[PDB]
């Protein structure tokens, strides 16, 4: 049974998340799920057409379990893993402001999202890091944006050029 909004691979993951009954297992499965299927650095592109929807159905389970487990002060200040939100936040920003180049800066930001995107980290700290990390990322990238010729830029990105065609 194929489909855009309803398909076998999605029904597969719903029964899989339904088996989760521990913020520990749930949180971990979301963390790993993001490592394997999101961002241009994903471990594979096999779930490309459903990962977005599945991730959310996974965030829900984690969020609920996190509410039934954490207390008021924790749900507001600690990650689903136990980490202290502000700690992580302040540490990541330090690494970012220390980043020597855009290549280093981009890895810090992307990795931050795959690891702490809610319901892992509290939204307030998460979006707070989003404004700081993103600011540092753009500042490094947009500096002399066009200096590097495409030929060299492709080598920097490390892309595998499969075909080039240009009449002009």
């Amino acid at each position: 049974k194929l489909g855009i909004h309803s398909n076998d691979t999605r029904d597969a993951w719903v029964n899989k998340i339904a088996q989760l009954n521990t913020l520990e297992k749930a949180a971990e499965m979301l963390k790993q799920f993001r490592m394997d299927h999101t961002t241009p650095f994903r471990n594979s592109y096999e779930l490309d057409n459903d990962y977005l929807w599945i991730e959310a159905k996974l965030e829900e389970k984690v969020a609920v379990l996190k509410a039934r487990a954490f207390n008021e002060v924790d749900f507001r200040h600690k990650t689903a893993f136990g980490e202290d939100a502000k700690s992580v936040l302040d540490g990541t920003v330090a690494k970012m402001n220390a980043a020597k180049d855009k290549w280093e800066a981009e890895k810090i930001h992307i990795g931050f999202r795959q690891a702490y995107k809610p319901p892992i980290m509290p939204v307030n700290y998460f979006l707070d890091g989003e404004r700081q990390l993103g600011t540092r990322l753009m500042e490094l990238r947009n500096l002399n944006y066009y200096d590097t010729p495409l030929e060299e830029l492709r080598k920097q990105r490390g892309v595998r050029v499969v075909h080039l065609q240009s009449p002009h």
């Binding site: 194929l2 489909g3 855009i4 909004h5 961002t39 241009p40 650095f41 994903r42 594979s44 592109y45 490309d48 057409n49 981009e106 992307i110 979006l127 707070d128 989003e130 404004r131 700081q132 990390l133 993103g134 600011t135 990322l137 753009m138 500042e139 990238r141 947009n142 500096l143 944006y145 066009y146 495409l150 830029l153 492709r154 920097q156 990105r157 490390g158 892309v159 595998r160 050029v161 499969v162 075909h163 080039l164 065609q165 240009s166 009449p167 002009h168």
Partner: protein
């Protein structure tokens, strides 16, 4: 005891002092610039005066629509081709209006000076009015027009086709995702100032020529609000002009914004004007040159020169790829007609003469192709022919730019024909120009949008359509059609029988 009152200006007089200082009083959005907290706004408005001036325009507009226009059966006496064209124009513009709401919300958060926040705020509410106005046009044509399908459900049926993806780039995501200032440039500095402002008025012209008095009534009302938004864009640059970061990033965020916007409108707007109408107003090549080169590129950008703003470096490159852009696109649009939510028509004899006269060489390429498809029966549901088959037969793959989502066929194009294909961490990427390629190479995580071939790979056409509800009331006849006549409409079965199955064109390089 003389009668006394207080006007908007008298209150706005003290609006700037409304904001106060405190540690965490700063934007919540990532940005490379620093908006000066003493920036002022042009129009001295307060919530109540704003509501009044807009309520007055609403009155005329709806009064015309509900009374005189309805009495004249204005919703019907419109050329079939234009009734269809407005399904796309109004609904697509509606999303631009809708995302502009969030964009100006982000900009209002970005501004530190109370007056600048107020200026952005007026636009927030304006973009809301415009969202509902565009919605009303479709709502009106649905209620009183010659063909409600599409008008009545574009919000969900637009998801079937490829043209919608690129619209979301310049009208949705480009408006709200990125540095607040980058978004401001896409929306106001370029989008509104260079395209939408002249466009909205232009649309009312083509509508009038094709019997449509509904659109002019609404779009002309929308137009009266655009000056406040022009100012907002202009004021955005004035606000950051003094921050040294500006001299380091403004001209790049802008050039990227220029390319982003023109990349979609250059072919799409020209296509809708010339191919979605019967009676013409002016050749798009002439229009484009004036809008982008004369008015915007010259006059407009020129005034921001004292602010360190320069003409987009990709400008001359935009003009080169432009000439045949819209003609190339309609070939793909028509070949893929079953994925839309509107009915398309092939050029008639008078029209082909118009194209050839304004575009020497048109007939030998596009003209002969259209007559071939028609003689082969592309308009007749019993022919078993859909133009997409012609592209396959003649080995003319159709790609989707990973960045702009704009469809392109370098093998057939009369315009740009460059093609760059790369592979990164197990994924293939197709690019149609040097500017977009750079954007992805530099910011690969900003551009992961899946194209229709990737999503629909392995699926049979009639199934994608049925699942995404591309059917009319009878649950059998397609919303989309290869002609605009009342008889011989294609059904889901006429499509199913073709056994057309989607394939990802990039895989041929494996």
């Amino acid at each position: 005891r003389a009668p006394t009152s207080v006007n908007a200006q008298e209150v706005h007089r003290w609006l700037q002092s409304f904001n106060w200082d405190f540690k965490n009083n700063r934007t919540k959005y990532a940005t490379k610039y620093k908006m000066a907290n003493e920036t002022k706004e042009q129009f001295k408005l307060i919530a109540k005066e704003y509501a009044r001036m807009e309520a007055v325009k609403d009155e005329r507009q709806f009064g015309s629509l509900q009374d005189a226009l309805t009495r004249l059966n204005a919703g019907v006496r419109v050329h079939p081709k234009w009734n269809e064209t407005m399904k796309v124009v109004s609904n697509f513009l509606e999303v631009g209006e809708y995302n502009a709401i969030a964009a100006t919300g982000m900009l209002w958060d970005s501004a530190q000076a109370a007056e600048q926040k107020n200026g952005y705020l007026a636009q927030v509410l304006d973009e809301i009015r415009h969202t509902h106005q565009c919605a009303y046009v479709n709502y009106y044509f649905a209620k009183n027009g010659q063909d409600p399908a599409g008008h009545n459900d574009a919000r969900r049926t637009r998801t079937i086709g490829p043209l919608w993806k690129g619209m979301k780039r310049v009208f949705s995501d480009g408006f709200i995702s990125g540095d607040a200032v980058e978004c401001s440039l896409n929306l106001q500095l370029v989008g509104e100032a260079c395209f939408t402002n002249p466009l909205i008025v232009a649309v009312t012209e083509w509508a009038a020529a094709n019997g449509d008095e509904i659109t002019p009534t609404v779009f002309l009302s929308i137009e009266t609000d655009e000056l406040r938004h022009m100012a907002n864009g202009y004021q955005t640059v004035v606000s950051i002009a003094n921050d040294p970061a500006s001299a380091k990033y403004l001209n790049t965020d802008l050039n990227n914004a220029f390319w982003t916007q023109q990349k979609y409108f250059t072919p799409v707007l020209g296509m809708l004007f010339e191919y979605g109408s019967k009676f013409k107003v002016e050749p798009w090549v002439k229009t484009w040159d004036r809008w982008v080169y004369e008015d915007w590129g010259g006059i407009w950008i020129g005034r921001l020169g004292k602010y360190g703003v320069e003409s987009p470096r990709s400008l001359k490159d935009a003009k080169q790829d432009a000439y045949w852009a819209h003609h190339d696109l309609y070939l793909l649009a028509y070949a893929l007609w079953p994925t839309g939510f509107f009915r398309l028509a092939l050029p008639d004899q008078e029209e082909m003469e118009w194209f050839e006269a304004n575009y020497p060489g048109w007939y030998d390429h596009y003209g002969k192709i259209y007559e071939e498809w028609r003689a082969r029966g592309c308009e007749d549901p019993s022919s078993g022919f859909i133009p997409l088959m012609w592209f396959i037969e003649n080995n003319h793959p159709i790609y989707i730019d990973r960045v702009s989502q704009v469809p392109f066929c370098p093998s057939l194009a009369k315009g740009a024909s460059t093609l760059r294909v790369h592979e990164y961490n197990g994924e293939m990427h197709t690019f149609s120009d040097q500017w977009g390629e750079r954007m992805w190479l530099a910011e690969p995580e900003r551009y992961e949008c899946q194209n229709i071939f990737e999503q629909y790979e392995g699926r049979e056409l009639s199934e994608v359509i049925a699942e995404l509800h591309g059917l009319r009331s009878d649950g059998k006849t397609l919303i989309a059609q290869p002609h605009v006549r009342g008889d011989k409409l294609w059904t889901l079965d006429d499509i199913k029988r073709l056994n057309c199955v989607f394939k990802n064109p990039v895989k041929a390089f494996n």
